[PDB]
Amino acid sequence: FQRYQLIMTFHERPVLPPPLIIFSHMTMIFQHVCRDYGLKLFITDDELKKVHDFEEQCIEEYFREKDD
Amino acid sequence: KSRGKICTIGIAPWGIVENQEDLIGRDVVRPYQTMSNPMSKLTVLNSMHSHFILADNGTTGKYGAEVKLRRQLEKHISLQK
Structure with a gap:
């Protein structure tokens, strides 16, 4: 059951590890002033039917x- | 009670359907109501029929527009190998 939580919490994390995650923390501020897969899957009406x-x-x- | 499908084909005249409209959608799913009103002087299409061939001669409310086509189709499929 907890495999799902593991997969999701590693899907949401930044790429860089905590030794050098300070770069990924700075870039979030730059995008602050400015899910195709992994969570969901969007399909057209034919596939839905x-x-x-x-x-x-x-x-x-x-x-x-x-x-x- | 059982799985599988039976290929039932209905060859009905177009002038006896209870709703000539609500069926004009070309190549699109159209809803149809099975409820019948005895005072409508017409009859409803029978469900549990896989395919329909509606033949019209231009009239409305009278039979006799499908016997010849049905017999011709039976003759042509009888000669099929």
């Missing part, structure tokens, strides 16, 4: 198998 059809097929098969 295909996913919905797949999911309804899966739930129908699940109920049918349980009854049988």
